[PDB]
Amino acid sequence: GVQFDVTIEIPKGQRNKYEVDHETGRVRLDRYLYTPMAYPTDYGFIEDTLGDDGDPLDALVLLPQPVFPGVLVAARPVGMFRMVDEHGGDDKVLCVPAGDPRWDHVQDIGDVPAFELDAIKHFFVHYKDLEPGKFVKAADWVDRAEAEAEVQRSVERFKA
Amino acid sequence: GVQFDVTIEIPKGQRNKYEVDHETGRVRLDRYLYTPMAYPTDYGFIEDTLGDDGDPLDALVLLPQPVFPGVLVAARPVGMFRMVDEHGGDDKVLCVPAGDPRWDHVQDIGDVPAFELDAIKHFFVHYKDLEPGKFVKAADWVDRAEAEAEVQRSVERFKA
Amino acid sequence: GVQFDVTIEIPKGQRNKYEVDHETGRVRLDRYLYTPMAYPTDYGFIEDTLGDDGDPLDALVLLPQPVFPGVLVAARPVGMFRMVDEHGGDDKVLCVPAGDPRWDHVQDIGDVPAFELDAIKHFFVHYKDLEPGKFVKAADWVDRAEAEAEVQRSVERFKA
Amino acid sequence: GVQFDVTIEIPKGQRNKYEVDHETGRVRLDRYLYTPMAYPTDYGFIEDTLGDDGDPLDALVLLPQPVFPGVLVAARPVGMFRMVDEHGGDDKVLCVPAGDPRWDHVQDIGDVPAFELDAIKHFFVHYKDLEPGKFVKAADWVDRAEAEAEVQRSVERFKA
Amino acid sequence: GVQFDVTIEIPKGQRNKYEVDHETGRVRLDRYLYTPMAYPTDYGFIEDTLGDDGDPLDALVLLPQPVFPGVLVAARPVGMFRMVDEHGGDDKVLCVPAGDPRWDHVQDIGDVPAFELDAIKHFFVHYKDLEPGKFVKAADWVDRAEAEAEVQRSVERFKA
Amino acid sequence: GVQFDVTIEIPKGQRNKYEVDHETGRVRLDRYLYTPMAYPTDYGFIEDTLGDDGDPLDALVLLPQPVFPGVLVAARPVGMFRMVDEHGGDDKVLCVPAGDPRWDHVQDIGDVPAFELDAIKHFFVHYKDLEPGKFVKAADWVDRAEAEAEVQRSVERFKA
Fold it and tell me: Binding positions for Mg(2+) 3 (chains A, B, C, D, E, F)?
């Protein structure tokens, strides 16, 4: 069913934390990570969504080769990382590239190897460890179904 | 005589197929090539041209060091790659950087070494070999004169 | 006191000379340097400033990891490189990242090691050596004080 | 059952064709490829084997991140690429990393997606297209079983 | 006083865990880290030392630009990272480049900024978190004096 | 006529100054350059030569893509850079790859564009500018002829 555009803010392997300014469209170097970690996958947000906090819904995209910040990728959801940090709840849709048969075998979170999900989860739990006031409290994984529903709501919030 | 601006969509050496969306201005990861090949030169399109198919005229730009997708380069034509694929005819203007005396010795397609033209041609002939329905039929090289004429028409089509 | 946004045009380590077109917002490959040199730090301009010559005030930003052309970084001044070239006077504010405590020990030009200031100065003195008509005549360093003053003036020129 | 050491000569993504000199141990830049292609996976030879032609048996290793020429990787076979070129028969064992549970799901050639095998095969069929006298005639895939047997013989040839 | 040669096994920024085999001299891809982390500095061992476990003493080397695995760097000690893992005690001498005046200001562990020591410590505490049976228990910092003493013993063990 | 092996110590684009230790065969990080410069071509020495100073004759090799330190390349001379520094005379043979027809049009120093020879010369004249006691006094270009002669002598010194 569902598919959308993700705007990659941060390439796999990067320790610079880029972000897109959501009115001006410009890309911004928010900060350099305080921990010796790097983004586990290409990271961004779903174009035309609105989360709880006036921010578009976050997205992880699985790619063979990282992209550049600002790049659009047409993607589809396979699961969702649920996380509660110091600004409270925050979710990240796990995605593969849409209409690329090389990802056809990846249909739900069951299809992504554990060592990969754990590596991703390990990054978000620890990446802000050396940043005062900043912490993480929940962190877990849910299936394409819950991913799809959270997307749907954020699309509807974006239209209101 | 003629010179124009090229928007590089894809850097030399890249296997990610970026493209510029021509209304929104945004850059897009179209697909990752199915063959183990990589763009033989920096690749883009001539700004303010319109081809037969509502798409700006394609350009190859010879550069010492690859640029980033979206980067403008002022360029001049030295020849043109004529190719007929599954969507029919499609041409690619061969360029060097404008007003850069290091390229002064390159004035027509005679001035580009054969092994380079062949490498470029070999890329377009084979890059879509593992992509169903997609094939290539003609593929040859023509001089700065024919390049200049096709540009001129595409500039005039862009003004209508 | 003072702090501002810098738009990085050229990453540390690059030999391609990118520049932002100031009306269109687009990024441009101006030229590939003629000397075997690479920008000693990330290089751009202070957003919303206007110099003597209708061009925004130049900026050097010290970063742990280079950014991409077009990226915004919030920054604060610690000194200024004064230089007179073939188009006359031209200054470059030395900046560190704003609100990043890892840079708290850098408060004025005294706090940047000499070998670094000399490396930067060596780049601007020599980078145009193989470029006809282009030369450099003055080149020296001044403190956060004078930096702050030149910024203020350029901000005020931008509002007129 | 079987597992061995591979010495990577050429990293995934490289167009430089490095080779190890088999007496001196030194690494050598044989040639830069004439086609705009790059090695589809990390490429080398199985340490302590001897093929038909006094050369150690060739190996492709599947890795998450490319290595450096000269690097040893402990590996296990999953299949074999059979190829007949201008020097006649030549085979390449397809391998994954030994004792790394992240590759446990890859047990025979059935387990490697078609688009990957085809990409590899496409590289070896075309990489020497622009090299006079050099051609390719057979090229196909066989299973872990045949891979294992060819290894065994090359190990025994190495002991004679 | 003391200075020695370090063989860098692993460049800053790498997630591949290279190691030197200490008889054969050859470099080996041990494993790819299970956590989304990357070596916080260039990492290796002190040439001609012998630790408690028949392995040369580990070293961290602070460098402006990462080297290649196998590269020798002449270095001097400024402190030492004391850590107890699953194989028991294991120490890591913190070094700067020898005879390089750019590092003259770094004379003991007091001279290395806290955010750097913490980043390094954070790496060794967490890098093996997703690796069964592997854990970390102590982890702290000591001064150039203790570094110098542990080196001295390992040099003497190497001569017996 | 003449052709030989070059051992590349330093890749084009690098600022780390690698060097091969000539007895042990090991590669060494000598220093990071003090100026914001990077080696204009791949740089090494002619294998089995001996200069005036017990050091093998230096070599520049022109390549499409840089190699790794320690890599051998079979090469042929097209000219020589003569230079006198603080340790007196020091020469560097300009080479292209042997038996590669893509370089057949480069037969003597006349065949290398001026902007290239000047770039190379500019690097050796300035790269040590910020290094106390270190300077450069002569620096010029001579033809394949003189190159061939200096090689011959160094080969003969190597055999004595």
Answer: 85, 90
